[PDB]
């Protein structure tokens, strides 16, 4: 005669996955902005 609930922990691997690939997409975006700027000068 008894019952029980249950809780959950996230995976360690995940860690700060919010920025694991955010930093990387931000870095690529910076590269793309540099590309865009250089192309703007070249077109001019």
């Amino acid at each position: 005669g008894q019952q029980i609930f249950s809780q959950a922990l996230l995976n360690a691997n995940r860690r700060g996955e919010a920025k694991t690939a955010l930093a990387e997409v931000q870095a690529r975006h910076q590269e793309l902005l540099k590309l865009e700027k250089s192309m703007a000068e070249l077109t001019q």
Binding site: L35, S38, L42
Partner: peptide, 19 residues
Amino acid sequence: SRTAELQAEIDDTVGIMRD
């Protein structure tokens, strides 16, 4: 690496066009 190569080519072409 492909994007860095593209950037390098664009910078070179900017130099040639300035010339």
